[PDB]
């Protein structure tokens, strides 16, 4: 048992632990036993749920897209027709997860993905199709499919998972960053140029996912909604950071919208009100 508080009686100390200098930038560990007479209590607590592995470590929906299974004859832009959809993987699009991750500067983790496909048939349909989804992980910078039945889907190298709509797929992706950790913040440019983009960098490329319904068309249209869930595991985090206070406006940037509302709540009363 780890002691939380030690028994401590009256103190006529000349080594005043309660007078310090915050000018130094140190949080001296002053305990209750230093300013009040205390009893001896035990922790009964390990702090398992505050470990970064747990704090940043449950599955969160990080992308949602709808794709369709329909007659593809006579369509030029299959992407526009929502026959397939791709998505550059990023954990920045959902703000809860982004703020949690942005509590740190550098983060290293392996990715466990869960893809949930759910079918809907809004228009008249005689039955529910037994559709199969192909979720193709394309490595960073690899060509995405350009049409629904492109040969890119038959890639001999791109990892692909085939699963029924209504069911899930699960697969882990190791940490794929070039550097020893992802740069959740980058104060630099890709090169010394006057006009080049700031912050957003290729260091944090985690890949991309393409989705299509493998089935040929039925007589009716089926709408499939794909939810990608990411779970970070084997998490390592460095350099704690000031938490995000203002809304986000874009991925990879710290920008916040103009004319934002005040973060700090105003007091109902003066500074003396409880």
């Amino acid at each position: 048992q780890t002691v939380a508080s030690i028994s401590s009686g009256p103190k006529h100390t000349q080594k005043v632990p309660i007078l310090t200098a915050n000018e130094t930038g140190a949080t001296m560990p002053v305990l209750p036993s230093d300013s009040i007479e205390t009893r001896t209590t035990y922790m009964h607590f390990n702090g398992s749920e505050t470990d970064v592995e747990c704090f940043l470590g449950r599955a969160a929906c990080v992308h949602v897209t709808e794709i369709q299974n329909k007659d593809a004859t006579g369509i030029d832009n299959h992407r526009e027709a929502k026959l397939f959809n791709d998505w550059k993987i990023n954990l920045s699009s959902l703000v809860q997860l982004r703020k949690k991750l942005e509590l740190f500067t550098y983060v290293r983790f392996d990715s466990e993905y869960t893809i949930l496909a759910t079918a809907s048939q809004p228009d008249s349909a005689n039955y529910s199709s037994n559709l199969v989804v192909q979720a193709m992980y394309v490595p960073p910078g690899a060509p995405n499919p350009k049409e629904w039945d492109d040969y890119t889907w038959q890639s001999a190298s791109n990892p692909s998972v085939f699963f029924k709509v209504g069911d899930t797929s699960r697969f882990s992706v190791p940490y794929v960053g070039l550097a020893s950790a992802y740069n959740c913040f980058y104060d630099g440019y890709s090169h010394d140029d006057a006009e080049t983009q700031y912050g957003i960098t290729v260091l944090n490329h985690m890949g991309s996912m393409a989705f299509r319904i493998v089935n040929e068309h039925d007589e009716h249209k089926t709408l499939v909604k794909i939810r990608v869930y990411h779970r970070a595991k084997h998490v390592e985090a460095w350099i704690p950071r000031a938490p995000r206070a203002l809304p986000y406006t874009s991925i990879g940037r710290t920008n916040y919208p103009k004319n934002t509302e005040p973060v700090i709540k105003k007091r109902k009363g003066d500074i003396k009100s409880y």
Binding site: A26, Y106, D192, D193, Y198, I251, N255
Partner: protein, 250 residues
């Protein structure tokens, strides 16, 4: 008293100057186990490990603060700047010494804080980027009290130019310069990066922010300003990949 002598430079302080070493980690040379670049690194002598004094800022009653980015602020400082421009890769720690003296009648409190990867926000919103010239200002740094510029960062000190609240900036290595207590702040910064060494030109490892928290209140009839002076010494600096001098904008 205290005295720090680096090369041909010396800073004496009649205050018992206690130094903050960011994350209790001293600057160190890149060890073999962490190294990726194969070239033998250039470890300069006294020529670079020395105190460079930047031009002083004036702290007025209504000044918001100042921000310097390293190693950008030292890009024009003697031999260090030249080496930073002639080499492809570089890593360095820093000993930052912020100086601001007043009388026992003045009041005010500066927050001196070092932010690794202080990615600045653009004041325009959306996904606009802060241009190179604004994030690499040099020894003048960024004055948070000036007006916005096209392609410049946002300059509301309450939000740290990044969308986080000022009160929370104490999570980073910092020291206060409380005019009643102390006149100097010393922070020793190690090399912080996801990569063992990096390009010194296109990437700023850390940002030094000096922010008035408690405003300057000078005694009656006194001049309503104080100078703030920043002195920096590169520590455990390494350079690799010497070649033709880099060309950067401004």
């Amino acid at each position: 008293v205290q005295q720090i002598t680096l090369g041909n430079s010396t800073i004496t302080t009649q205050e018992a100057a206690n130094a903050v070493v960011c994350y209790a980690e001293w600057p160190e040379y890149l060890p073999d186990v962490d190294a990726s670049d194969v070239n033998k690194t250039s470890k300069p002598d006294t020529s670079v490990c020395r105190f460079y004094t930047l031009d002083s800022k004036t702290w007025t009653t209504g000044s918001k603060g100042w921000c310097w980015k390293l190693p950008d602020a030292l890009k024009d400082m003697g031999v260090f700047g030249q080496n930073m421009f002639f080499h492809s890769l570089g890593r360095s720690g820093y000993t930052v010494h912020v100086q601001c003296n007043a009388t026992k009648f003045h009041s005010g409190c500066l927050l001196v804080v070092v932010i690794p990867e202080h990615q600045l926000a653009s004041h325009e919103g959306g996904n606009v980027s802060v241009k190179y010239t604004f994030t690499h200002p040099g020894e003048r740094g960024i004055d948070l009290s000036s007006a916005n510029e096209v392609g410049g960062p946002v300059k509301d000190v309450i939000y740290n130019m990044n969308g986080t609240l000022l009160g929370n900036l104490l999570i980073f290595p910092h020291q206060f310069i409380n005019l009643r207590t102390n006149n100097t702040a010393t922070i020793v910064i190690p090399y912080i990066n996801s990569v063992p060494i990096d390009s010194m030109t296109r990437h700023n490892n850390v940002s030094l922010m000096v922010i008035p928290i408690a405003p300057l209140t000078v005694p009656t009839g006194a001049t309503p300003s104080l100078p703030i002076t920043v002195t920096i010494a590169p520590m455990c600096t390494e350079f690799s990949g010497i070649r033709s001098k880099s060309i950067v904008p401004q």
